[model samples]
Target: LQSRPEPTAPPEESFRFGEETTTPSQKQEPIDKELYPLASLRSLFGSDPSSQ
Candidate 1:
């Protein structure tokens, strides 16, 4: 049986930039306060709302 050879990385590739316009990894935060109600609620209270 033949043994598997060790994996090798690709040759050095030059840095690429300016190809695409800069964009946020994630969309901007919610602008509306009501949009994220749980966020504020959680901060005010613990994860368990009922406190059970």
Candidate 2:
């Protein structure tokens, strides 16, 4: 039997949304997946009719 490899942590810290510092006024509400599946689909496809 083969041994399994250990899982690794997500590389979230290496990512930056934009500038080095975020301002209080730049924040927005986090998306709610259950209520907004359509919006998420639109974001992925960006006006492509096939996405709908």
Candidate 1 per-residue lDDT over residues 3-52, each given as its tens digit: 86534423332124433434465346544456677766666766553344
- In model 1, what is the error at residue 40, expressed in angstroms? 1.0
Instruction: Give me the runs in candidate 1 sitting further than 4 Å from their true place.
Output: 1-23, 30-34, 46-52
Query: Which 10 consecutive residues of model 2 have the lowest summed lDDT?
Result: 5-14
User: Model 2: runs farther than 4 Å from truth?
Assistant: 1-17, 20-23, 26-35, 47-52
Q: Which pairs clash in the backbone of model 1?
A: none
lDDT of each: 0.49, 0.54
Per-model TM-score, in order, reads 0.23, 0.22
In model 2, pairs of residues that clash are: none
